[PDB]
Amino acid sequence: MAGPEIVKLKKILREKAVPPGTEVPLDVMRKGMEKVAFKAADDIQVEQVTVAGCAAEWVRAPGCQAGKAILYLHGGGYVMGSINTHRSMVGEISRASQAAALLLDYRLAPEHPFPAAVEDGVAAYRWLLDQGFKPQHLSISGDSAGGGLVLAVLVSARDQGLPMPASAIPISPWADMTCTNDSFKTRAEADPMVAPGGINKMAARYLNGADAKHPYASPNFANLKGLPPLLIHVGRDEVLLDDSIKLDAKAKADGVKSTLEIWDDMIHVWHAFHPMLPEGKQAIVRVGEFMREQWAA
Ligand SMILES: [Cl-]
Ligand code: NA
């Protein structure tokens, strides 16, 4: 059934998880995420750059093809996460796709609420086009809050007249700020991650009074017509299951070439656990293949 890695991983995550209900201050969560972040592989080279007023890093694994790039939007519920927390996983995505990744330190809430993150994402994409990268040589990817942001950035870029990239790969996307999908109940017991009444708090902090059904905050409610080919990754054992299934339905309905992959026994952004999780490495390899596939077309 389930690999021994995932089983032990779920065990470890449940042991370290903070009890439901307990309110962890934001700076504490932010420092905790930074503290436990995985160190990127020794062969991942990095270059600090500033993009659209944001700190960023070009994350290049060996084997990167010149002319191609990935705009990567990190997870962290729009309130935490950074270049440092995602450098390891992004390095591996760069390895599998044979393309350098632009890891953006976009503005976070509550200091900079919605639509600050979307503006930064769109500006970073504009920046890439301005640097000379061709739309057909580009890809946008991100996890969790970052996965939703991938879609939000695409819709906003499109509305502003920007060309669409060759592909987009949202990982465990959070594309519905309302958090009302059934999976928050049907997949809760199997989701070792936290938890959430904790997730409603992040939505509150990000929106800061904005309509939770705003297209740029919750892409599952947006018009996705014209968006590029999509690869949607999501674990069957996560509370955001329904977000990915509904995103896929919305996309196909809007004429978008969408490919949803629900990985059995997997958890929220299981990719991040590639060091100890075979499925993690596998999923990342798949993201890379899909990106290469779309760039070849
Ligand atoms: Cl923001
Ligand atoms: Na198909």
- For residues 205 and 79, give the distance between their C-alpha atoms in angstroms, rounded to a whole number: 7
Tokens 């890379």 sit at which residue?
288
PDB resolution in Å: 1.9
Ligand nearest to C-alpha 216: 1
Beta-bridge partner residues of 263: 235
| 6 CB neighbour count, 10 Å cutoff | 25
Domain segments of the chain as ranges: 1-297
The active-site residue out of 74, 86, 233, 268 is: 268
Q: How was this structure determined?
A: X-ray
The superfamily in CATH containing domain 1-297 is Alpha/Beta hydrolase fold, catalytic domain (3.40.50.1820)
Instruction: Calculate how far, in angstroms, residue 113's C-alpha sits from the geometric centre of ligand 1.
Output: 4
User: Is 258 assigned a catalytic role?
Assistant: no
- For residues 224 and 83, give the distance between their C-alpha atoms in angstroms, rounded to a whole number: 28
In angstroms, what CA-CA distances link 60 with 75, 90, 155, 274?
Answer: 20, 9, 27, 17
User: Is 189 assigned a catalytic role?
Assistant: no
Instruction: Calculate how far, in angstroms, residue 259's C-alpha sits from the geometric centre of ligand 2.
Output: 6
